[PDB]
Amino acid sequence: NVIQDLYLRELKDTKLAPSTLQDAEGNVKPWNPPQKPNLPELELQGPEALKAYTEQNVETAH
Amino acid sequence: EVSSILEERIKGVSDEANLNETGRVLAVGDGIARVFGLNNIQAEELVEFSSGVKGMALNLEPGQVGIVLFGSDRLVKEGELVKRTGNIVDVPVGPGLLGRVVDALGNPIDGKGPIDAAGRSRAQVKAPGILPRRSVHEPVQTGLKAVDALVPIGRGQRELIIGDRQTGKTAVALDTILNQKRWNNGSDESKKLYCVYVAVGQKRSTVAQLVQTLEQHDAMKYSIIVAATASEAAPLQYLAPFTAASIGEWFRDNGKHALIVYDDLSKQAVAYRQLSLLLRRPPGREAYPGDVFYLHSRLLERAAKLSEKEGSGSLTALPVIETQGGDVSAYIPTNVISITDGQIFLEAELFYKGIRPAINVGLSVSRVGSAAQVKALKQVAGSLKLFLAQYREVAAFAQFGSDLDASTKQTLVRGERLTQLLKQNQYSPLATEEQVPLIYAGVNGHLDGIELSRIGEFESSFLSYLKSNHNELLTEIREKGELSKELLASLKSATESFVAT
Amino acid sequence: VRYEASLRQLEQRQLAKSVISRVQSELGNPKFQEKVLQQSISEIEQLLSK
Amino acid sequence: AKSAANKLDWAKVISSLRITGSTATQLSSFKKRNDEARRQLLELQSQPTEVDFSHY
């Protein structure tokens, strides 16, 4: 009755309100994927180090 | 979309039939109405005021039936009609309340869309009898070392958290919820606890932070948060534990094991005090109505470990009582102490002393339950209690300029280390498998020598060391739950190995 | 998802206030009179069913 | 797994005790332990490697 009147009239005669899709985009992030952060490298390259370490390291006692 | 949903809501309104019973408001205000009429009326019924307010009925008088409002006074007016709902107070109960904050009525106040309820239940339901019970055979470990070892908590059992207000009073309980994440992550329903945190009388900001904290630790996904914020009606507050209880009973009935924190139960008492004093019942001791004892007792006894026949479903309870002035001689703390199956006194001085947890172990007991803790942890903490008791005695003696002998100072030195061992930072639960080693070390006095400052360092490092080498050992502690000869020896050797380095 | 859900709620409350506007529209009319006649006959149907 | 390496390592720690000097041996052991402990904590930290486009 009043139920019908309210239902019909309201639903039909008022269809939505404006909204901004752009603003929605603003509050969220699309995110582009990180690419190659750092590449591994040759560990302690230079056999200057190797000879040095062999010769220097000898912490055994007399 | 939104239009279709709205269309559904309006569509879901349609027609009515003759409304039985009426009565006209007369005197009204305070939140307590008295209506003339309503000749037929069940007690504790919900009656719809024409303002929009719904109110339970607590007085049936041969004059004017006294309907306690669950809404604002301003809405109500003189000579309004009230038409009886025809339902004694009832709550929607279901699975969907998991992951929901709900107000006393049961509407989501976090508004994650209306609850999915598998039933409705009644707010007053009497406690399960002697016949449907089993004795407590299933531990529930809070992950706070002092709690697990000293005051073992078992499913079913009502264990009282009592102590000075908001001295992280909430935080002690929250830690339990967080360690129940560990089982939650796991499997086997009866080895899982669902968790209902009930918040009565607390400000919206505390509650909002709390729900945020639970979401932060991502422990929201198996919790029900029942709330009745400080603003909310004294009638709604009085009804709030009892409607939480029914939601818990849905778990209990399902055979599910769960734990209900009633924080603060003290605020229920304030609510009932108000309620009674505006129903003009003769006021009891300290103006709390005498049947406050009855109220609390009936509420607390609804949680139980059921019989095997009755599915075992263990609702476990943790009441939390604020102790105003820290004196438990007040009527409400005295009453609660009798009702509860253990007491977990927390002391402010020890908080300041830097014992965090600040639980005073001298005043903390679990008067029943000992199969409420892990066998391994029981063995190790067998003399943890004795040592601590001795530490307390010796320390007491030391006061007032007594020059201690070395034997007493062996105890004292050992004792001090235990105290440092217990401490745990807020929101940092631990795994029991890795609490057993720490106590082994302490009780077997391996820490006694270790310098007082670096005990915390030792604790951190020791755990790392056990993670490194003896991760096999930890797995076994998880698997067998009682230390075997092999484990005791392994553990002894490991502990010895870490004393230096 | 979060902003999307927020927008569904925001839309719903905006369109809610439009329902309030429709209520104000209904209550002006001498439908205010004509539906009372409807209520009168409806109560006649109801109480005769008693 | 990691435990084979670490049992053999710690067996060697108490063997290296027998020999003298280890002032920077221990830093090497510390490095291998550190980063080994980092990768396990990484592997336990792990999220699924792609979105759940089922629910979300």
> Taking CB atoms and an 8 Å cutoff, what residues of chain B touch C46?
17-18
- Cβ atoms of B292 and B272 within 8 Å: the answer is yes
Q: Does C19 touch chain A (CB under 8 A)?
A: yes
| B51 vs B55: CA distance, rounded Å | 11
> Least CA distance to C5: which residue of chain A?
A24
| B51 vs B74: CA distance, rounded Å | 9
- Cβ atoms of B408 and B191 within 8 Å: the answer is no
CATH, domain range B88-373: 3.40.50.300
User: Among candidates B115, B413, B121, B81, which has minimal Cα distance to B247?
Assistant: B121
Task: Give the angle B245-B251-B256 at the CA atoms, nearest 5°.
Answer: 140
Name beta bridge partners: D16: none
| A1 vs A7: CA distance, rounded Å | 10
The answer to the question of whether B170 is labelled as a binding residue is: yes
> Taking CB atoms and an 8 Å cutoff, what residues of chain B touch C12?
2, 5-6
Distance, CA of D25 to chain centre: 16
- Tell me the CA end-to-end span of chain C in Å, nearest whole number: 53
> Least CA distance to D6: which residue of chain B?
B469
Q: Which resolution in angstroms does this entry have?
A: 4.5
User: Among candidates B160, B163, B193, which has minimal Cα distance to B178?
Assistant: B193
Compute the count of residue pairs across chains A and C with CB atoms less than 8 Å apart: 40
Q: Name the structure determination technique.
A: cryo-EM
Amino acid letter, D24:
A
**Pairing state of beta strands B315-322 and B257-263?**
parallel
Cis peptide before B110 (omega within 30 of 0): no
Q: Does C43 touch chain A (CB under 8 A)?
A: no
Please give the C-alpha separations between residue B384 and each of B407, B415, B432, in angstroms, as whole numbers.
18, 9, 16
Task: Give the angle B116-B157-B364 at the CA atoms, nearest 5°.
Answer: 125
The answer to whether the CB atoms of D6 and B464 lie below 8 A apart is no
Q: Does B489 touch chain C (CB under 8 A)?
A: no
| B292 vs B331: CA distance, rounded Å | 10
> Taking CB atoms and an 8 Å cutoff, what residues of chain A touch D25?
59
| B74 vs B67: CA distance, rounded Å | 16
| D46 vs D56: CA distance, rounded Å | 19
Cis peptide before B448 (omega within 30 of 0): no
Q: The sheet that has B257-263: what strands, in order across it?
A: B100-102, B223-229, B193-202, B257-263, B315-322, B160-163, B342-345, B365-366
> What are the phi and psi torsion angles at C47 (to 5°)?
-75, -25
The answer to the question of whether B435 is labelled as a binding residue is: no
**The two three-digit tokens of residue B66, written as one number:** 């006294």
> Taking CB atoms and an 8 Å cutoff, what residues of chain B touch D7?
469
The answer to whether the CB atoms of C8 and B18 lie below 8 A apart is no
Query: What is the 3 state secondary structure string of B344-372?
Result: EEECHHHHHCCCCCCECCCCCEECCCCCC
Please give the C-alpha separations between residue B133 and each of B354, B454, C41, in angstroms, as whole numbers.
41, 48, 59
Name beta bridge partners: B228: B200
Q: What share of chain B is helix, strand, coil (3-state, %, to 5)?
A: 40, 20, 40
Tokens 């599915």 found at: B311
Which fold would CATH assign to domain B15-87? Answer: Elongation Factor Tu (Ef-tu); domain 3 (2.40.30)
Tokens 């336990």 found at: D44
Q: Which CATH superfamily is domain B374-501 in?
A: ATP synthase alpha/beta chain, C-terminal domain (1.20.150.20)
Sign of CA dihedral B451, B456, B462, B468: negative
Q: Residue B365, class by beta-carbon neighbours within 10 Å (0-12 exposed, 13-18 middle, 19+ buried)?
A: middle
The answer to whether the CB atoms of B3 and A3 lie below 8 A apart is no
| B319 vs B340: CA distance, rounded Å | 8
- Cβ atoms of B23 and B35 within 8 Å: the answer is yes
User: Among candidates B83, B75, B106, B120, which has minimal Cα distance to B67?
Assistant: B83
The closest CB to that of A61, out of D20, D23, D25, belongs to: D20
The closest CB to that of C11, out of A1, A13, A19, belongs to: A19
The answer to whether the CB atoms of B10 and A16 lie below 8 A apart is no
| D26 vs A10: CA distance, rounded Å | 79
Tokens 């002092």 found at: B146
Domain map of chain B by residue range? Answer: 15-87, 88-373, 374-501
Tokens 């004059």 found at: B63
